Amino acid sequence: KQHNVVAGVDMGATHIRFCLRTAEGETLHCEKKRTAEVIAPGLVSGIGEMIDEQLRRFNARCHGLVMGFPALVSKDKRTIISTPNLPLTAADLYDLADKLENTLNCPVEFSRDVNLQLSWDVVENRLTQQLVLAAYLGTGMGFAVWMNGAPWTGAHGVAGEETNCSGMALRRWYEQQPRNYPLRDLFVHAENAPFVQSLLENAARAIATSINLFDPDAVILGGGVMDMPAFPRETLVAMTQKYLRRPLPHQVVRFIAASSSDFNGAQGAAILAHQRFLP
Amino acid sequence: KQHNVVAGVDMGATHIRFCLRTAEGETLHCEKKRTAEVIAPGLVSGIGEMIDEQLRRFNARCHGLVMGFPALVSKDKRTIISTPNLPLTAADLYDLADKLENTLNCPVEFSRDVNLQLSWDVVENRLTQQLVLAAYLGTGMGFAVWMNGAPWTGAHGVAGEETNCSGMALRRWYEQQPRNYPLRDLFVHAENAPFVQSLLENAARAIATSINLFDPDAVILGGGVMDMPAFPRETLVAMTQKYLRRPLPHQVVRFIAASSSDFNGAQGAAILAHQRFLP
């Protein structure tokens, strides 16, 4: 049984997620591999063989690849323009889009990881025709924009770019002295720490600033910091609402909690590949 | 000699500027009237007769009106959604777009005043095909966006919306105690006042925040505060550049000084009317 597919790959420091989506919009396959294993034969050979084994298995023809990176990506989506925190060399990233195209025999585009999460969340929340802003609080504060039916990256591809309002800032505060609880449980025991409340207020000001400037239909809040036990999502939303201009955008902007699931990112990439390289 | 024209009107507290632009892109007429005089017969009758006298004079047919207000304007450009600081009643603004259309026999759109200045500056700087951000420092901090060949207003028309970083903040500081110099000469004598330097740093942070989020090709800096004698434009640009993410957008965003001339706003409105209602 033949299949026409697109490939979605989300590239992490420890794992790589990979999804195959049919022309019909069906998820044909999803897998998670360890990054170290995939790149052992060289990055291009590794990805090429990871994808091609599944194409051969499902008798699939691949019409394109969207690959996610925790890094800045050029306007034309072909060049990684910041050093990603991945176990890859400078040489590996060099001319990667062309090398992947030659090996995979289909177009290849790159995307910043937060656009993949944004795409999953926009499609899942029925927001594809709206102006949507996403704030992803992880190791740093990640912001993304959905506009005109696609992720929006500005003039040079770097739209949506805080030292002390991030996962790194929380880690550095935690590390100041010995704690009776693990870092992952910080919000269970330290939600009311003066420094933690200042971080939440800051994040709130930043989110509210972005909302006042874009005037979106909706705002998706998420990131790895929001997945931590006892993270006060309701307090952050209420803090942000204090700074929204009234009557509009205060009375009309809708707040959505981001989906946090293993394959969302890879699936997001597959959805973007489908839009760009099909129907 | 027949003429096909569009009307551009910029509405101020003291004066109203009015421009007629031909289908051929020629400025046929410009005039400045006192707002009080124009509205003496009622606002609709006043504007209708101000425009119609010139149409009769030039034997002109009007294909549309873009009218500027120091106020928020709805997404569909037909409703003024904040109270403007003009000598008009609530009743005068009510259903104004329809009343003007019936009287003038052409389509009528409204625009926030800063979009008119933005349009003049974008066309004059050959930036119509770029992503352009404008920061207009007047009584308040006004921001505007040019994207996809036109002013961009967000989902609800209020994109681009600081208590102590504005013309009002400078006025209130000036008024704290008697001064040996007039308010208009504040930057000649008080550029280095600790409060004035804090205002400039704040404006810089705000401008830099907007640039980091939109990642524009260019930024137009202006407003009535920048027209004041000795305003340190170079210091503000240098302060803003400290906060721009490097290499991009720091090494590629271009800074432009806004044009400050009597009819720029009315002309901006005429340019928008031409785009919307001609060729």
Curated annotation (Swiss-Prot), chains A, B:
The keyword Transmembrane belongs to this UniProt entry's keyword annotation: no
GO BP terms: D-allose catabolic process
Xref: InterPro entries: AlsK, ATPase_NBD, ROK, ROK_cs
CDD domains registered for this protein in UniProt: ASKHA_NBD_ROK_AlsK (cd24070)
Gene3D superfamilies noted in UniProt: 3.30.420.40
Pfam name, any one: ROK
Biological role stated in the UniProt entry: Catalyzes the phosphorylation of D-allose to D-allose 6-phosphate. Also has low level glucokinase activity in vitro.
Record-stated family: Belongs to the ROK (NagC/XylR) family.
Name of the protein this chain belongs to: D-allose kinase
Lineage: Bacteria, Pseudomonadati, Pseudomonadota, Gammaproteobacteria, Enterobacterales
